[PDB]
Design a protein around this ligand. Sequence first.
Ligand code: AZZ
Ligand code: AZZ
Ligand code: MYR
Ligand code: MYR
Ligand code: MYR
Ligand code: MYR
Ligand code: MYR
Ligand code: MYR
Ligand code: MYR
Length: 582
Amino acid sequence: HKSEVAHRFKDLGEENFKALVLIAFAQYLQQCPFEDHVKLVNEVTEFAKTCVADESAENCDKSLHTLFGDKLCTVATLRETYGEMADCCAKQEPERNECFLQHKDDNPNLPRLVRPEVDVMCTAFHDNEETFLKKYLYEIARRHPYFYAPELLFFAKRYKAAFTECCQAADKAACLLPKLDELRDEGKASSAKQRLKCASLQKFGERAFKAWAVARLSQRFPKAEFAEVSKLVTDLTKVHTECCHGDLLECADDRADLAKYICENQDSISSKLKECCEKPLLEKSHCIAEVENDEMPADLPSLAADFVESKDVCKNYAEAKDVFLGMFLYEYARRHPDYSVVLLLRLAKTYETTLEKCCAAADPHECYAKVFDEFKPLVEEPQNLIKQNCELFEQLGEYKFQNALLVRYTKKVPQVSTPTLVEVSRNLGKVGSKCCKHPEAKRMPCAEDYLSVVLNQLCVLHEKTPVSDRVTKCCTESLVNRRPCFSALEVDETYVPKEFNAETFTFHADICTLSEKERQIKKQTALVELVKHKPKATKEQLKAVMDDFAAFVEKCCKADDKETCFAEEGKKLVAASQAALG
Ligand SMILES: Cc1cn([C@H]2C[C@H](N=[N+]=[N-])[C@@H](CO)O2)c(=O)[nH]c1=O
Ligand SMILES: Cc1cn([C@H]2C[C@H](N=[N+]=[N-])[C@@H](CO)O2)c(=O)[nH]c1=O
Ligand SMILES: CCCCCCCCCCCCCC(=O)O
Ligand SMILES: CCCCCCCCCCCCCC(=O)O
Ligand SMILES: CCCCCCCCCCCCCC(=O)O
Ligand SMILES: CCCCCCCCCCCCCC(=O)O
Ligand SMILES: CCCCCCCCCCCCCC(=O)O
Ligand SMILES: CCCCCCCCCCCCCC(=O)O
Ligand SMILES: CCCCCCCCCCCCCC(=O)O
């Protein structure tokens, strides 16, 4: 408007305003103390208020970036603490803002943030709700300088809502701790997703991204016209290019403009944007991003007509291959919400691979008159797995099932950090329950969304601590082949069973006194180690020793003494195993 500051304050509101400014500065000045950021926020906020009362007061005409940069440069110890970053204060705005971007650190050498006791958290919440929430928001923000601010804000309110509900409950911990875990996990998945897209836009390219967006937007807005979808994909692409550069304000405006365009064209995109569009800026785009799939028109012909029989097909394909394959993808995508984008892309690639060789023959219509046959095996696969796993996830519960993955993966690539094997296994497990719950129509898309992050996380580690090239092969394979690659790893047969060591299996009674998350992650570390020492063991074998061990501990937690039991009735089990498996 006449003043940017004013305008952002007016529609964001004072409370949200204060919290975003805090997250902003917390992400650059990651080293300064909370108390300092509060002075800052309050200052900036008093100024904002100045521009709201008189939208023409001194300096209110300045742009946010400018103002932001000016405040960053007033920090007395900028150069002493951030050193080179302080040099940014010498450039002329555009360059300055760009300079600040590139100096923001991502590996803040800061201590892991620990979860204090429920009683103290609850007490802290109660005594001073704002300092408590804003303090932790500041803590999460300075350790994650790239986590999109608004989204972090959105998480805070969930944290606030969980304390609010739990701290005044009967069994606080049992109420609170699980919700805090659902937020930690969820919070990590979100961080991972946004870095993955920005990475993909880098690797795979702007085109591949678009292909991905068309598939995704068509499943969500099946009723819209290819032209309409296509318009949204071009915009969606920019939004994410700019956003991936890292400027919070630019990124925010792009998401806002798009969300507004979508709401002003509702009846041309979806009939599911009712709610979201009534919401205020902040929540609007976010809301839209999680909207449900509109229903597809019952009418809808079939792909056969326009993509196989129809004359002009090779003609349409040569005039605009990209737009053409875009329409294929679009038409298929909107008819199949239950497919994972990536699956939709193999289909699209395959179709392309056929028209490329087929429109080169003397009579194509014959060459490609059976493409849809090549599609069946490609679709059946991801489906059949989803079934094999989700069904198995029944016989056994999450934990007992994570123990199946655990063994299966340790035997594929046994030369991998045992604690990385435990994390990945457990993570796959959670993916199994977060999804297998959904109906046979949201499964594949869910898995795709969660398996991806888990897979990238596992590649990032493998990238930093390489070991097995097979994984490397999968980690450097194509966007569309990553998963199948992993799903095709066979048990490794070159493995040299790990040197024995009874210590790795030496246990004590200190475990009859540990929470689930504890007991588990230990019964699982031995299980993994047990496979690396005798990978030639079978499921009947391990499903046996897993019992001779489990029900063994219950016998030491049922004995007057323990230490002896956990060594006496132990070792007795070790030998009874180092024999029954050799
Ligand atoms: C990245 C991220 C982490 N967290 C969680 C994970 C962190 N612990 N660990 N590991 C915890 C630190 O308070 O917050 C969150 O709530 N939101 C987020 O966006
Ligand atoms: C669609 C989607 C996007 N994101 C990313 C993309 C958003 N940025 N942009 N553009 C970012 C917003 O926090 O989160 C996400 O974390 N989960 C999702 O489901
Ligand atoms: C905008 C974010 C506001 C966050 C307020 C967070 C309060 C978090 C307590 C977190 C305890 C986490 C324990 C853990 O991750 O292991
Ligand atoms: C002086 C510091 C000013 C910081 C202002 C931050 C404003 C953030 C607005 C974010 C709007 C997001 C809209 C959306 O995601 O759809
Ligand atoms: C203003 C944004 C409205 C977005 C509605 C999005 C439905 C999105 C499925 C999106 C996958 C998006 C990836 C990205 O945005 O970078
Ligand atoms: C208006 C935009 C139309 C875009 C049409 C895109 C068609 C993309 C086919 C992409 C195949 C990608 C295969 C791969 O990335 O490995
Ligand atoms: C020790 C490192 C192990 C890394 C394991 C990566 C495993 C990826 C598995 C994907 C499995 C899909 C299974 C299924 O669909 O039924
Ligand atoms: C404990 C792990 C449970 C895993 C269940 C995995 C279901 C995976 C479905 C994968 C579909 C992949 C589709 C694709 O890659 O194109
Ligand atoms: C040298 C002998 C090493 C034995 C290692 C045994 C590891 C057993 C893990 C058992 C996990 C059982 C889980 C369950 O029963 O629900």
